[PDB]
């Protein structure tokens, strides 16, 4: 799979488990079209979102439902969700890992792109 | 001002200057309505986006145009922009500082909220 | 003041108040000599640590006592403290802002340096 | 191995490869005693630092030579190194992953502790 998502919890120092993730692809009319979704596993990872054939160049949005995650833990969060928007390119063969670190009032996201 | 945005550059270790910021509010019909916009100053801060009167309860989106910022420095970054989505003033009026820390392939954002 | 420290809390989305900060300078004999210390104020800032005259070239260490901060909130954190080590004024005098963002199992620190 | 280190590069959006890492254990006299060292691999990971038998409760310091890393890339960095200091506990069986995200003027570190 060319696309992977990894989510970490900065408060408990653990993978963020069972977090909902929705991926969208930008359509010709500039609206967001559902592309793939899933929930993070006990490793805080989400594999098998898509394949090489379907993952063509374009603009993608990864939406992480952080609000429901903090609500489950009884912690009041600031953000409705975390959004990561990027362009996928074919500048050679590549695997994309979208990593996110979550706190109730802060989040960080990083792209790890390897060949 | 109830809403302030502060942007830093993690590569140069300086404020991020002349960064475009657009703010939207979710309308009754569920679409994003333009709320305000501006550019960061020499100190990486954006003040005067709105007033107490105008800044009513609702869901807001702060979009920071990170791509244009990195491209003007010769760097092709990963993200199209950084988006911060939150509910504001749902327990009464508050002052919000949205801070963002930028790297070409990573960003973090934090909220500082005071009564 | 040439040296300023700013500390934020990622869990509460507020400045980190009453956090102890100790600053050390590397001496000729390679040991850490106490340089200054203080606690953050209501705004999470620590000013007046030193003056231009006293803040000469050298390697400095800023130690932020994060453990005591989290323990006073009922949280047992991961780190003993956050340490920031840097060479200062090796290309002439500068003004340094050391910012830190705290979570129980994570922290980030950034430097803002201006001429 | 109960202790692992993972290092990421926020500028290039890749693992930080061939980064030197030194681990120390706090001795009864409060000095830092060398414990283990190595260089990160092509995955930005460092495995096999120690074993269950030798990794007893105590205070450990992980030092990441970030300065040499940025120097190799021709980017001027702020910090001499990144330091992570923590207490290892036997609160049940556990594996520790110390993750770090690097920019020239900023770094973040997180502990991912799983069972």
From Swiss-Prot, chains A, B, C, D:
L-thyroxine binds at residues 6, 45, 108. The keyword Signal applies. The modification 4-carboxyglutamate is found at residue 33. The chain holds residues 30 to 144 of 147 of the full protein. One of its GO terms (biological process) is phototransduction, visible light. The keyword Ribosomal protein does not apply. Belongs to the transthyretin family. Changing residue 51 to A: In AMYLD1; amyloid polyneuropathy and cardiomyopathy. Changing residue 33 to G: In AMYLD1; amyloid polyneuropathy. This is Transthyretin. One of its GO terms (cellular component) is azurophil granule lumen. Changing residue 38 to R: In AMYLD1; amyloid polyneuropathy. Changing residue 45 to K: In AMYLD1; early-onset amyloid polyneuropathy. It comes from the Eukaryota. It comes from Homo sapiens. The modification Sulfocysteine is found at residue 1. Changing residue 15 to S: In AMYLD1; amyloid polyneuropathy. Glycans are attached at residue 89. Changing residue 38 to V: In AMYLD1; amyloid polyneuropathy with carpal tunnel syndrome. The modification Phosphoserine is found at residue 43. Changing residue 101 to M: Loss of tetramerization. Not glycosylated under normal conditions. Following unfolding, caused for example by variant AMYLD1 'Gly-38', the cryptic Asn-89 site is exposed and glycosylated by STT3B-containing OST complex, leading to its degradation by the ER-associated degradation (ERAD) pathway. Sulfonation of the reactive cysteine Cys-1 enhances the stability of the native conformation of TTR, avoiding misassembly of the protein leading to amyloid formation. Changing residue 107 to S: In AMYLD1; amyloid polyneuropathy.
């Amino acid at each position: 799979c060319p696309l992977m998502v990894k989510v970490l919890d900065a408060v408990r120092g653990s993978p963020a488990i069972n977090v909902a993730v929705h991926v969208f692809r930008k359509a010709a009319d500039d609206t967001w079209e559902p592309f793939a979704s899933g929930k993070t596993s006990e490793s805080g990872e989400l594999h098998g979102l898509t394949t090489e054939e379907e993952f063509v160049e374009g603009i993608y949005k990864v939406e992480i439902d952080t609000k429901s995650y903090w609500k489950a833990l009884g912690i009041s969060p600031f953000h409705e969700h975390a959004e990561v928007v990027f362009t996928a390119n074919d500048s050679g063969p590549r695997r994309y890992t979208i990593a996110a670190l979550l706190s109730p009032c802060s989040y960080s996201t990083t792209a790890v792109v390897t060949n």
